[PDB]
């Protein structure tokens, strides 16, 4: 282990509790001492990884399994269709256009020609007349985007260059004169940009200097009549709704704004699904933690009526107006999708299609489209684009595109869903994937994934690397739908946040206990993996029950729960986590903060045989979302407490960081991501003493 300096003078008082921070100096990513740490850890990592002789076998198998063409879900503008394509191994997906769904594609924008495809497209917007394509380009490693506009007819750029954007969409008016977007000043704003003008001329529609942390999303209705502005605070599923009637402006957007403030609190979520003139259909969680559809007339805005009442059991995850007078509702029913077709006007059910284990997403059809397309994936189904022609054949899903994994016979494997009790009795759904016919004799290596926060739904989607694990390591994979997610509505989220964050960890630990008791695996043959809030999941669980796990892989985790709120966008997570500035919330946080709860398990009576799992801490060197000090401080703390603070420690399992050079949080070019995942699985196979098959 490399020498890592401790600054024994750094100590802080939290409400009478003294907390030492000997690796505070790792918070400065620019010092030579920090850069030397990174160099030293990289060297150590490389030295451990070169002992992991299956990395190259995993890598090539992952490459081979990923090497298949993928056509994304198409969407329509005017007569043209647009979609993403990848021939299999391109660094990023290429944006294509066609005149006909089965006609020859033209390339509209290829991210691979820029910076070797470090980053793909995240902002992509096509104008209503299909003549213009607005998209976001990253300049360097930062999160800042520049919006450029290309003409679809000849692929020439407009001069227009819009700076100081991050995650804004570009929302076009039906007159094709320009678009709404939400930039920051050189305090997010809502602006309108006219084509052929400099950004300095853009019309200001909204700012709130009195609430600088409030952030914005926007939308235009399918009829082109209303601009909707949504105002959000932090990460809560709740928002304001402001409506601007574009038909009543004396001189268009040039006239400048006078929003109708339909909803002006943060009490509930509201997404506009459809309107007929002033009569709006919303999706909302108001008095409905599993969501519902409601109707309100802007001309009588006090009076809301249920259109599709809240299900007693199932989350209404999304809703989409289609074929002029219908709705497709996407329900999540015990973490499996159910698609319903309903009448828009009455809300009446017409058809109901339960979906197999997997996930349907990517419905982009608009009210005026009669063909709806969507994507289905699952652990054992790489990717199908389905089409449903509501005009001519409403009852049938037809396969439009079907991905094929080379040399993968899905019939050798099986996926099941089971429900397991947490400490408090609560039923936790888990998916379990494995070779068919295995013996439940405790002998299989097992990988478990989870997240558990922020109302995020964890779906069992396709992963090529997971198939390598299953087939070539004889592995058992588990995806655990722990609390803190949104899978059973807002009550599931809140049963796993703030003072109840510990429930999330208990759920995950309860799942691992089930997999051991049921005979899939055994204590110390279980690997756990998670990212971001899921990286926190991994780090807390290994601190609390190191005896259960043989390998832990924490991707860009939030590890200093006392100081996270002080860096970049960490302040937006206090909704889920609390904040150590407030004593009560400090008292939740200090009990599970990963860098504050590293302890030698062998010093606990009865626990003399126990060490920490083999641990890989992963992070990009320029993650501006979750700053890498989290990872670095946890690494330093573990290495110290468990290894270099002792002459001949019992901690034999390696503790290392895989630090990606010249990487942001976003990017993930194919080969870069494959390299990372190959390293994570080779390490796991070595940690669990699992042979290649």
């Amino acid at each position: 282990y490399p020498p890592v300096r401790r600054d024994e003078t750094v100590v802080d008082d939290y409400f009478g509790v003294k907390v030492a921070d000997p690796y505070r100096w790792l918070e400065d990513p620019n010092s030579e001492e920090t850069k030397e740490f990174v160099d030293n850890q990289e060297k150590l990592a490389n030295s451990v990884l070169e002992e992991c002789e299956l990395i190259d076998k995993f890598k090539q198998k992952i490459i081979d399994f990923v090497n298949f063409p993928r056509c994304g879900v198409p969407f329509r503008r005017a007569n043209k269709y647009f979609h993403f394509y990848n021939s299999g191994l391109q660094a990023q997906n290429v944006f294509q256009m066609q005149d006909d769904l089965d006609g020859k594609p033209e390339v509209l924008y290829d991210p691979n020609l820029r910076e070797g495809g470090r980053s793909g497209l995240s902002l992509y917007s096509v104008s209503e007349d299909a003549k213009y394509f607005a998209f976001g380009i990253h300049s360097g490693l930062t999160e800042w985007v520049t919006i450029k506009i290309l003409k679809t007819e000849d692929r020439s750029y407009l001069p227009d260059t819009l700076e100081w954007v991050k995650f804004s969409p570009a929302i076009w008016t039906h007159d094709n004169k320009g678009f709404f977007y939400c930039p920051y000043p050189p305090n997010q704003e809502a602006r309108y940009h006219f084509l052929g003008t400099d950004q300095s001329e853009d019309i200001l529609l909204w700012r709130d200097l009195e609430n600088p942390a409030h952030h914005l999303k926007c939308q235009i209705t399918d009829d082109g009549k209303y601009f909707l502005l949504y105002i959000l605070d932090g990460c809560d599923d709740a928002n304001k709704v402001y409506c601007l009637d574009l038909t009543k402006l004396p001189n268009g957007l040039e006239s400048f704004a006078p929003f109708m403030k339909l909803i002006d609190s943060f009490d509930a979520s509201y997404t506009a699904i459809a309107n007929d003139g002033s009569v709006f259909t919303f999706q909302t969680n108001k008095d409905a933690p599993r969501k519902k559809l409601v109707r309100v007339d802007l001309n009588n805005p006090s009076v809301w009526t249920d259109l599709v009442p809240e299900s007693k059991k199932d989350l209404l995850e999304s809703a989409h107006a289609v074929n002029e007078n219908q709705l497709i509702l996407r329900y999540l029913s015990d973490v499996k999708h159910v698609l319903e077709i309903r009448d828009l006007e009455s809300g009446a059910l017409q058809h109901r299609l339960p979906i197999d284990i997997g996930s349907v997403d990517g419905i982009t059809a608009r009210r005026r489209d009669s063909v709806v397309f969507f994507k289905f994936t699952s652990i054992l189904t790489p990717g199908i684009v389905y089409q449903c022609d509501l005009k001519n054949d409403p009852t049938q899903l037809k396969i439009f595109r079907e991905s094929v994994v080379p040399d993968f016979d899905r019939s050798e494997f099986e996926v099941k869903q089971v429900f397991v009790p947490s400490k408090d009795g609560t039923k936790i759904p888990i998916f379990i994937a494995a070779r068919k016919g295995i013996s439940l004799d405790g002998s299989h290596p097992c990988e478990m994934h989870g997240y558990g926060g922020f109302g995020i739904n964890m779906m069992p989607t396709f992963s090529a690397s997971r198939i390598v694990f299953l087939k070539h390591l004889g592995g058992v994979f588990c995806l655990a739908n722990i609390r803190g997610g949104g899978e059973y509505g807002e009550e599931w989220h809140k049963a796993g946040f703030r003072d109840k964050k510990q429930n999330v960890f208990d759920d995950f630990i309860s799942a691992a206990e089930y997999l051991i008791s049921s005979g899939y695996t055994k204590a110390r043959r279980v690997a756990i993996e998670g990212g971001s809030n899921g990286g926190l999941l991994v780090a807390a669980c290994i601190n609390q029950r190191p005896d259960l796990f043989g390998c832990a892989e924490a991707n860009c985790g939030v590890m200093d729960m006392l100081r996270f709120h002080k860096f970049t966008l960490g302040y937006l997570w206090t909704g889920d986590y609390g904040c150590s500035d407030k004593e009560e919330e400090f008292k939740w946080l200090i009990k599970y903060s990963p860098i504050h709860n590293v302890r030698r398990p062998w010093e606990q009576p009865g626990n003399e045989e126990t060490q920490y799992p083999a641990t890989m801490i992963l992070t990009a060197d320029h993650d501006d979302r979750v700053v890498p000090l989290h990872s670095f401080k946890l690494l330093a703390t573990m290495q110290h407490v468990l290894c270099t603070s002792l002459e001949d420690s019992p901690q034999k399992n390696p503790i290392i960081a895989r630090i990606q050079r010249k990487a942001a949080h976003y990017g993930r070019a194919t080969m870069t991501q494959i390299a990372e995942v190959a390293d994570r699985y080779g390490f796991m196979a070595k940690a669990l003493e699992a042979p290649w098959i």
Binding site: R70, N86, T377, S463, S465, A669
Partner: peptide, 6 residues
């Protein structure tokens, strides 16, 4: 818009 299901 992930480039591949890795």
């Amino acid at each position: 818009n992930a480039s591949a299901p890795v």
